Amino acid sequence: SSLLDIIYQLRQVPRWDGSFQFEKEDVSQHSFSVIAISHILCELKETLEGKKINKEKLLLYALYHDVTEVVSTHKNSLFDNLPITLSDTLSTILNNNDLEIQEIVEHADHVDAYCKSCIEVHRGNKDFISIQRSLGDKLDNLTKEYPYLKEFQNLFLKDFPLENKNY
Amino acid sequence: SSLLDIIYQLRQVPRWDGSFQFEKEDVSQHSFSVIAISHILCELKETLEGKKINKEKLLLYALYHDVTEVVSTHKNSLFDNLPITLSDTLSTILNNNDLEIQEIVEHADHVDAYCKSCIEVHRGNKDFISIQRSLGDKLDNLTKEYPYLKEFQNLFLKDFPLENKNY
Ligand SMILES: [Mg+2]
Ligand SMILES: [Mg+2]
């Protein structure tokens, strides 16, 4: 199985190609943030909409949401010699039809892109100012239709990144 | 809350300090791999030991297993303005007493360190040969006591990284 190789190969897939970055990020760093953001968004959505979401399937889907970018950058070798318990879980993630999980991860993906733009602008990267504005405007519109995104915005995105890191 | 800031700040925490690396890895890349390895190990352990493990708590624990390294490198600002649903989940991860989850993540942590050594040696880094041998010897001993680690070894660690990436 090439599954473990693909997990580490994601470090070789860059993002934001064509734009100058003070910090070049890869898909593994991006997917790490999307997992964490997906879980936070899901907890907020659970309380606001009065529900419980299966966070196992959500976190696993966010974990592999850009796994196809090892081929197409930014499916038969995965299951080779793979046991039935791993192939079933991998098939459920790869052939997901849970629209709510897809929506949360898509929102988390947009939040991460906006966070990346905030960090670059914070570093002094004027080339990301227009990217931050477009991603921020689209995010503001999403907060009008998804209350859990507005809650996330009020909790973290009002001062990001932190002025003084007092942990 | 500094939670989101800390998630991205983990990119600034290096690993393997004092050793030459062809690819300097950070804690976010490392934690991404540990999450994926923890889930794979858990599925194998479930089938071999005849059980079901709560993968939500496992994945979340692996997600934040090195979150304390934003201060100590390689707790009151986290809960500031944090809602009760997020503080409870964060407290459960930070104050975990599930010994099985801790053991799986500790094993996944050792597997990732060995995988990193394999990649560096594969790149041609002779300085990681002795590290790979020590990590490999300790892993071989663990396979004698934990059958799910031996299964993982047979599935992925016999040819890692892949000679020819045929995806
Ligand atoms: Mg993505
Ligand atoms: Mg670790």
Q: From the centroid of its chain, how far is CA A53? A: 18
Q: Which ligand is nearest to the CA of A13?
A: 1
Structural domain count, chain B: 1
What span, in angstroms and rounded, lies between the C-alpha atoms of B40 and A62?
15
Distance CA B25, CA A75 (A): 27
Question: How is residue B157 annotated by DSSP?
Answer: I
Helix axes B84-94, B55-63, angle to 10 degrees: 80
Other Cβ atoms closer than 10 A to A97: 7
Please state the separation of Cα B24 from the chain's center in Å. Answer: 16
- Which residues of B contribute to the annotated binding site? 15-16, 30, 65-66, 74, 109
Optimal mutation site among A7, A11, A75, A160, interface B, most CBs of chain B within 10 A: A7
Give the closest ligand to the alpha carbon of residue B111. Answer: 2
Please say whether the dihedral angle defined by the alpha carbons of residues A136, A137, A140 and A146, taken in this order, is positive or negative. negative
Would the CB atoms of A7 and B55 count as touching at under 8 Å?
A: no
* A67: three-class secondary structure by DSSP: coil
Q: Nearest to residue A116, comparing CAs of A37, A41, A13?
A: A37
Gap from B141 CA to chain A (nearest CA, Å): 21
Between CA B25 and CA B17 the distance in angstroms is 10
Dihedral sign for Cα atoms in the order A123, A124, A128, A130 = positive
| C-alpha A145 – ligand 1 centre gap (Å) | 21
Peptide bond preceding A161 in cis form (omega within 30 of 0): yes
Where residue A156 sits, what CATH number does that domain have? 1.10.3210.10
Distance CA A115, CA A111 (A): 6
Structure tokens of A159? Answer: 């001062």
Contacts of A71 in chain B (CB under 8 A): 167
Residues in chain B with CB shorter than 8 Å from the CB of A29 are 11, 26, 28-29, 32
Resolution (A): 2.0
Q: Residue A110's domain spans which residues?
A: 1-167
CB A87 within 8 A of CB A122: no
Elucidation technique: X-ray
